[PDB]
Amino acid sequence: SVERIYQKKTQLEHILLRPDTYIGSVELVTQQMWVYDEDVGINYREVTFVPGLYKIFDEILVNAADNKQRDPKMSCIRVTIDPENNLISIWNNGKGIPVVEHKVEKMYVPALIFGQLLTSSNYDDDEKKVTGGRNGYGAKLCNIFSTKFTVETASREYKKMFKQTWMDNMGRAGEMELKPFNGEDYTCITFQPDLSKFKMQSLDKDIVALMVRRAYDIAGSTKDVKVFLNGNKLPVKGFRSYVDMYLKVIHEQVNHRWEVCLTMSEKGFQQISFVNSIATSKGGRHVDYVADQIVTKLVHQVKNHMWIFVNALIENPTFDSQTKENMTLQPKSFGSTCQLSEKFIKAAIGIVESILNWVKFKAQVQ
């Protein structure tokens, strides 16, 4: 009884036993947000989906983007969503993953970082990196919440092609398959989400609408990277064009680590931001960093008329929940500063309207 009452759990068991701790809610939620609907495009609706499922997807997408930092020659990302076969696949070019056995861990690097918990190349904070990768859980959580998870990576360097498959929530893997290789390097993660774990019948419209919009986010938050979806290249060419989709407008590429866009808001303070290609959908201090700067410059009263669009690269970011929707790192510990051109600060005044304040010269009488 003492043994049945006081239990010790393995890590894998705990993740499956307490999902919401690692990937967020595995229950349905309903809330308004920007999605990209088939035939209608990017719009702001009400949506019902499981955050846990959107997350394991986001994890593999960001890893794809992250590879851009690791290798600048990366040119594009190819996303594939197929509801009927319940298949998702993310592909990226750029330096593949070293297909060689890891001397300390005693196993091939790919099998190590996609099949073992707490494995990562972002564990050394002296590197001060601007990747979304950080905790080393991501790819594994997706693997842990898939019925089938496949990893295929190719590195010219070690001149080999690695391919392996996991099944039943990473509870069993297939036989590692290696082949000689010599070509352009690529990596492709193909997974079948364990929809049972999320109490879903299939990849419905909403969740698909969310994911598709994320591919657009990537296409807009990364640099010199082309994003493909189901075979068609998305029409995003930088942040500005991306921001455009919402406005169909003061802009500025402060530097290599920033880019901001402002515009009026008839619906209170509106913000849309990204940190290392992560969709910080609730906010963060990186967004409050620019806002409060722009605001004060021309002065809460004014902020509420703003629709800010921020896209930054931050060193070793720090977030709230597992849904990483609200960043917190201190503006001091950013790795760079964001200051507007005299121009911007100027071409940003054409929001000012003491008109409502002036017109406030009404009189209340019986």
Place this chain on the structure above:
Amino acid sequence: SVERIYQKKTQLEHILLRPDTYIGSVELVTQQMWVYDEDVGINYREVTFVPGLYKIFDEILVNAADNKQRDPKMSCIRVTIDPENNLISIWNNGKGIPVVEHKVEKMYVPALIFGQLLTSSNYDDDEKKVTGGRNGYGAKLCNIFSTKFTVETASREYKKMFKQTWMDNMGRAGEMELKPFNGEDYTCITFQPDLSKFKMQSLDKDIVALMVRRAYDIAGSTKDVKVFLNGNKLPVKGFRSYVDMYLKKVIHEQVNHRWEVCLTMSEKGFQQISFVNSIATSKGGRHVDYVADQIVTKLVDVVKKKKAHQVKNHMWIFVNALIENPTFDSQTKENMTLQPKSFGSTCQLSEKFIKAAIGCGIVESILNWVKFKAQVQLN
């Protein structure tokens, strides 16, 4: 090379290397909240503190209160906060922890659940409990983030007392000293927060005011439990007297063994103060929505006779609830996200409660105000 680049961290290493993920922010934050200041009492001011620090304290406090759902006979919780010595201790009576060796982990239970990760007596969902604990990290996290963590529990049932100290972020631990016992069993854990991991120099005024308010929260949210703060007994007997601190017209009702509600008129927009299994749900959750909405409706009703989200904005509601396997969206359990369908119980206010609700300074203010706005011209 490859070995230096791709690393595998250990569970303990990982927690220290990535705090925010287990205990929330390890940085200072500034927000408005109720706290209990020395000599002033409960007040709403601005506060600057580290969530992670508050969390490790809250994990041991809630653990003490969780024991009440384990031994209904528990009757007291004693809390000690010694800034000067950077020491905190939380004492509780009632059934102590089984001082015996765990046959599968081949080590004593106290040592197992306070020193090994992923250990809990709440991994059995079926059991259907209303404790704050559910993930088996809490205690280990207070330990991992303390320079010294001492665990002492006495158990009459096993005729023994246990006592062991851990040190340097659960990196090392002294020897386990056992002794005979047969008195009233109790559990007390003492720890010294590794302030440096929090960028702190000491337990300042702010963080202590918050830790002290939690002590009062426990007094107000646990059933028949006297609470002591540094040897002195907090003057709180049950939820109603707890709610009274916040006030210098109030509606009350203990719906059932798992729900207690207090309602008053608010002048600063919707207001809520609540608890789920003694956890401070500062940002609300489905449980507050469930009680509030049910009240707003009966009020909107008397509105038609003579405004909707407008009604909810005149309300100051207090909710103490016991929920089964509660869920939170954050590293702070400030917002309880479970659906009412899975609560494990219901909470339909009494016909006698709504009646009284219709009479407090509420409708007479909406109607008074609707009237006001009608007889107004804009010149």
